[PDB]
Design a protein around this ligand. Sequence first.
Ligand SMILES: CCCCCCCCCCCCCCCCCC(=O)OC[C@H](COP(=O)(O)OC[C@H](O)CO)OC(=O)CCCCCCCCCCCCCCC
Ligand SMILES: CCCCCCCCCCCCCCCCCC(=O)OC[C@H](COP(=O)(O)OC[C@H](O)CO)OC(=O)CCCCCCCCCCCCCCC
Ligand SMILES: CCCCCCCCCCCCCCCCCC(=O)OC[C@H](COP(=O)(O)OC[C@H](O)CO)OC(=O)CCCCCCCCCCCCCCC
Ligand SMILES: CC(C)CCC[C@@H](C)[C@H]1CC[C@H]2[C@@H]3CC=C4C[C@@H](OC(=O)CCC(=O)O)CC[C@]4(C)[C@H]3CC[C@]12C
Ligand SMILES: CC(C)CCC[C@@H](C)[C@H]1CC[C@H]2[C@@H]3CC=C4C[C@@H](OC(=O)CCC(=O)O)CC[C@]4(C)[C@H]3CC[C@]12C
Ligand SMILES: O=C(Nc1cc2c(cc1C(=O)c1ccccc1)OCCO2)c1ccccc1Br
Ligand SMILES: O=C(Nc1cc2c(cc1C(=O)c1ccccc1)OCCO2)c1ccccc1Br
Lengths: 470, 470
Amino acid sequence: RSFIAAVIAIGGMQLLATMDSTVAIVALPKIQNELSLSDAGRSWVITAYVLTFGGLMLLGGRLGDTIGRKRTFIVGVALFTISSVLCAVAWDEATLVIARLSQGVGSAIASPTGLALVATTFRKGPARNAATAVFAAMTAIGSVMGLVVGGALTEVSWRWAFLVNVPIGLVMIYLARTALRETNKERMKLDATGAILATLACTAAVFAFSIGPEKGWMSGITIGSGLVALAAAVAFVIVERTAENPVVPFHLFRDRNRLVTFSAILLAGGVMFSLTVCIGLYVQDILGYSALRAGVGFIPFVIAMGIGLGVSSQLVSRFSPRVLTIGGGYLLFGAMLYGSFFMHRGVPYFPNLVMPIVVGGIGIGMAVVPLTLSAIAGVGFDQIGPVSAIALMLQSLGGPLVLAVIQAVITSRTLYLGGTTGPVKFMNDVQLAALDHAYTYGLLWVAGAAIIVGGMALFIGYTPQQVAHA
Amino acid sequence: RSFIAAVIAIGGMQLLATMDSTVAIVALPKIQNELSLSDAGRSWVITAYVLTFGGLMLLGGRLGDTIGRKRTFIVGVALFTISSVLCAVAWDEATLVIARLSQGVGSAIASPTGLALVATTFRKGPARNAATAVFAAMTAIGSVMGLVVGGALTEVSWRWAFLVNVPIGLVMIYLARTALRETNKERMKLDATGAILATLACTAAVFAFSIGPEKGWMSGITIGSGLVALAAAVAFVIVERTAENPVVPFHLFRDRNRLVTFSAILLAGGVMFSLTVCIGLYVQDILGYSALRAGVGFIPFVIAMGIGLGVSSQLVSRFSPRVLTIGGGYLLFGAMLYGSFFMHRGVPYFPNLVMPIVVGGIGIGMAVVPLTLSAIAGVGFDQIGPVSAIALMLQSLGGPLVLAVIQAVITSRTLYLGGTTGPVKFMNDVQLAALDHAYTYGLLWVAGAAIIVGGMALFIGYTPQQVAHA
Ligand SMILES: CCCCCCCCCCCCCCCCCC(=O)OC[C@H](COP(=O)(O)OC[C@H](O)CO)OC(=O)CCCCCCCCCCCCCCC
Ligand SMILES: CCCCCCCCCCCCCCCCCC(=O)OC[C@H](COP(=O)(O)OC[C@H](O)CO)OC(=O)CCCCCCCCCCCCCCC
Ligand SMILES: CCCCCCCCCCCCCCCCCC(=O)OC[C@H](COP(=O)(O)OC[C@H](O)CO)OC(=O)CCCCCCCCCCCCCCC
Ligand SMILES: CC(C)CCC[C@@H](C)[C@H]1CC[C@H]2[C@@H]3CC=C4C[C@@H](OC(=O)CCC(=O)O)CC[C@]4(C)[C@H]3CC[C@]12C
Ligand SMILES: CC(C)CCC[C@@H](C)[C@H]1CC[C@H]2[C@@H]3CC=C4C[C@@H](OC(=O)CCC(=O)O)CC[C@]4(C)[C@H]3CC[C@]12C
Ligand SMILES: O=C(Nc1cc2c(cc1C(=O)c1ccccc1)OCCO2)c1ccccc1Br
Ligand SMILES: O=C(Nc1cc2c(cc1C(=O)c1ccccc1)OCCO2)c1ccccc1Br
C-alpha cells in the first residue's frame, strides 16, 4: 500500500497535465460557440497555459530545494485543482485567460517536482525502475482518458469537462500527503536574479514564438520580444557564472553523456509531439472518428504501452539504455512505416489501427523508461531539481520546433497534390483526398526524425550499473 | 516437369558462379602452400576471374541478340564447366591464372543471358514471379554449398573442390537443352566498335582498381591504366550516339524509375557484398568456426531465405515493389542491429546466431524478388539483353565501392581501440578483442548504408500491374 500510493501520488501531475491538455483540445470548438472569442482568441487559451508553463518551469525546479519537494508538490497541484474550477466558471475571454495562466503556474511548479520526487524518494534499483514505469504509464493513461472524458460529456457542456480534474486532483493530494515523507534537509537559498532573468527570457521567447504567426514574423513586436528574450538570456548566462546555487548548472552538462542524453530527449519529445498531433488531426479530420470513439479506440495504446513499460522496467537492470532505446524505437519505426502505406480513409479498425497502435505503443513504452532513468542518472540531491526541470523543459521545447517543419511538409504537399489551405469542413472530397495523402506522406518525415533520434541514442554509453543498480 | 526443369536450368549459372567464388575463397590458403605463388599471386587468382568477368559482361548482354539466348547460355556454361576442369589440374601460377580467366569469360557470357532468359522465357504473371524467386533462391544455395563442399573436402585436396562444379555444370546444360525452347527470332547485328570500346574501358578500369593497392594509387601504371579506361569510356559514349543496335541504350535510363531502380541495386548490392564479406571474416577470424561448420551453420539462412522468397512471390501480385523492398529491408535492419550489440566472441549458436541469420534471411529474400522484377520490368525483347547485363554489372560494381569504405572504418577503429594491422594468426587476445569490437562496429555502418538504400527505394513508384501482372 505504501509503495503503490507513492508511485500513484508522484505521477499525479503527469496525469492531470496531459488529461487537461487533451480536454482543452476537445472542448476548444465549443468554447468558441459560447464565449465567442473569435479566431484570434482561439489560440490564447492554449498559448496562455503554454506561455507560463514554459516560462516558470526553470524556476519551479530550484523551488523544491528552498521550500521542500513535498510541499512544492501539494502547493503546485493544489493551485492546478483550484485553477480548473475557476476555468470551468469563466465569464468571458479575460477570465478564461487568467484561469489558464493560473493552471500553467500550478503545473509549472509541480511537474518538475514530480520527476524530482521520482529521483529522490525511491532509491536506485528495482524501486526506481518500477516508479519510472508507473510515472510514464500515467502520462499515457491521462491523455486517453482525456479523450474519453472530453468526448463523452462534452455534449452536455464543456464546463463539466474541466471540473473532472477536481476529484482526481484532490485524491492525488490526499495520497501525496499520506504517502510521501518530508525529508528535512537544510533549505538552500534561492537564486533571485538568476531565476528572474531565466523566467523573463523563457516567457518572452514563448511570447514572440506564439505571437509571430498572428501578427507577423517581422512586424516589430515579434522580433522586439525576441530581442528582449535574447538580452535576458545573455544576461542570465553572464550572471550564472558567479552565481551561488545556480538555476541552471551549465558546468553539469559537460559529461559528454548528459549532453547526448539531453539532446536525445529534446528531439525524441519533438518526434513524439509531432506524432500525436499529426495522428490526432488525421483521426479527427480524415477518418472522422470523434473524440469519444477515438478515445475508446486508443485504449489498446494504453494496454500496449503498459506492457512495454512493464517489460522494460525488468530489462533495464540487465540491458543498457542504448539497446533498449534502439529496440523500442525500432518497433515504433515499423509501426509508422506500416501506417505510412496502408492508412487510407475508410480502412477497418482491427487490421489497420489496432496493430500499428499496439506495436507502436510497445516501442514507445520500451524506449521511455531507459531515457528517463539515464536523464536522472548520477546527479545528487543538490542538483536534481534543475536537472529534472531541464529534462521536462527540453521535452516540451522540442515539440513545436520539429512539428513546425512537419506541418510545412503537409501544407507543401497538399498544394502539390491539389488542395486548399482552408478548414476541413469545406472540402471537395478530392481536395480531402489530397489532405489524406499529405498526412500519410509526412509520417515518413516523422520516421526520418526518429532515425536521427536513434542515431544519437548510439552515443548514450550508459551501462546498466549507473542507471538501474544499487 | 517442364516448369521445374526450366527454372532450375535458367538459374543454374547463379548456382555455379556463386558456389565457385566461395570455394575459391575457402581453398585460397591451401593453393598457396602447394603452388607457392606468394602473397602477390594470392589476389591474381581472384582478380583474374573478376577482371574478365566485369570486362566482358557488357559484351555478353548484347551477345544473345546476335547468336541466341539459349545457345549463348549453353556455350557460356559449357566454357565455365570446361574451365573448372583445367583449373583443377593447374601446374603452376601462370596456368591457374589462365584457368581463372577462362571461367570469367564463360560466366560473363552466361550470367547476363541467365537473367535475360528469366525475362523472355516466362510470361509476366505468376510464372515470372515464381521463376524470379527460384533464380534468386539458387544464388544463396550456391554460396552455402560452396562453404559446405569447400570446407568438407578441402582436407583431402583443394583440386577436388573445383571438380565438384562439373557434375553440376553438366546437369544444368542437360536441363537447359531439354527444357528451354530456342525462340527463333531474327538475328540482330552486333555493335563492333561499341562492344570493343566497352570491353576495353571496363577491363582497364578493373585492372587499374585491382593493381592500385599492389603498386600504388599514383605510380603511373594505375593512373596510366585509368587514363586508358577514361579515354575508352569517353570514346564509347561518343560512338554510342549514332550506334545501330547499341551495347548500352543510354536513352533507356531516362524513365526516372529505371534510374532509381538501377541506383538501388547498385548500392543494395554494395550493402549485400560488404555484409557477406564482413560476416565471413568475422565468423572465420573471431568465432573460429571453420568452413565446414560455418557452412552447416548457414543452412538456416537458406531455409529462411526460401520462406522469404516464397512469401514475396505471392505478395508481389498484391503489394507494390516499394513496400516489399522496405518491408524486407526493415527486417534485415533489425537483424543487423541485433548482431551489432549482442555479437561477441564465444557466444552460443541458437540465441545469438540462428535468430539474426533467420530474420535477416527472410528480410533479404523478401526484398530480392521485387527488385529483380522491377529491374526487368517493361523493356521488351530487343533491349532486354543489355538491361539485364547492366543490372548484373551494377550489382557487382557496388561491392568494392561500399566495402572499401567499410573496411577503412574497420581498420580505423581497430587501431583506435588498440590493435594490429597484421594477420589474425599473431594476436595477443587483447588486440583480437579490439578486432572483435571493430567488426561489430562496422556492422552499424552497413546498417547506415542500408538506410540510404531504403530512402532511394521510396522513389521507385512501380505498381504491381507493371511488374507482376498479365
Ligand atoms: C518520448 C520522450 C522520452 C524522454 C523522456 C525523459 C524526460 C523526462 C520525462 C519523462 C516522462 C514522459 C514520458 C511519457 C510517455 C511518452 C508520451 C506518450 O507516448 O504519450 C501518449 C501520446 C499522448 O500523450 P502525450 O500528451 O504525452 O503526447 C506526447 C507529448 O505531447 C509530447 O511528448 O499519444 C500517442 O502515443 C500517439 C500515438 C502513437 C502512434 C504510434 C505509431 C503509429 C503510427 C501509425 C499512423 C496512423 C495514422 C496516420 C497519421 C498521419
Ligand atoms: C560519451 C559519449 C560520446 C562522446 C561525445 C561524441 C559526440 C556526440 C555525438 C553526437 C551525434 C552525432 C551524429 C547524430 C546524427 C544522427 C545519425 C544519423 O543521421 O544516422 C542515423 C544512422 C544512419 O542513418 P543515415 O542514413 O542518417 O546516415 C547517413 C546519411 O545521414 C544519409 O545521407 O542510423 C542508425 O544506425 C540508427 C539506428 C536506430 C534507428 C532505428 C530505431 C529508431 C531509433 C530510436 C527512436 C526512439 C523513439 C523514442 C520515443 C519514445
Ligand atoms: C541484393 C540485390 C538486389 C537486387 C537484385 C536485382 C539485380 C539482378 C540480379 C538478381 C539476382 C541476385 C539476387 C540473389 C540473392 C541475394 C544474394 C544473397 O543474399 O546471397 C547470400 C549471401 C552469399 O551469397 P552471395 O555470394 O550472393 O553474396 C552477396 C553477393 O556477394 C553480392 O551481392 O550470404 C549472406 O546472405 C550473408 C549473411 C546475411 C546476414 C544477415 C544479417 C545478420 C547480421 C548479424 C551479424 C553477425 C556477425 C557480425 C559481423 C560483423
Ligand atoms: C514519392 C515519394 C516516394 C517521395 C518521398 C521521398 C523523399 C521526398 C522523402 C521521403 C523521406 C524524406 C526524409 C525524411 C527525413 C528527413 C530528416 C529531415 O530532418 C529533420 O527532420 C530535421 C528536423 C529539425 O529541423 O529539427 C531532413 C530531410 C529528410 C532526410 C527527408 C528527405 C526527403 C525524404 C527522403
Ligand atoms: C563507439 C560509440 C561511441 C558509438 C558511435 C557510433 C556512431 C558515431 C556511428 C554509428 C552509425 C554511424 C553512421 C552509420 C552510417 C552512416 C552513413 C555514411 O555514409 C554512407 O553512405 C556509408 C556507406 C558508404 O557509402 O560507404 C555516413 C556516416 C553515417 C551517418 C555514420 C556516422 C557515424 C555513426 C553515427
Ligand atoms: O492527443 C491525442 N489526440 C489528438 C491530438 C490533437 C488533436 C486531436 C486529437 C484527437 O485524438 C481527436 C480529438 C477529437 C476528435 C477526434 C480525435 O487536435 C489538435 C492537435 O492535437 C491523443 C491522446 C491519447 C492517445 C493518442 C493521441 Br494521438
Ligand atoms: O561468403 C560467405 N562467407 C565468407 C566470405 C568471405 C570469407 C569467408 C567466408 C566464410 O564464411 C568462411 C570461410 C572459411 C571459414 C569460415 C568461414 O573470407 C574472405 C571474404 O569473403 C557466405 C556464404 C554463404 C552464406 C553466408 C556467407 Br557470409
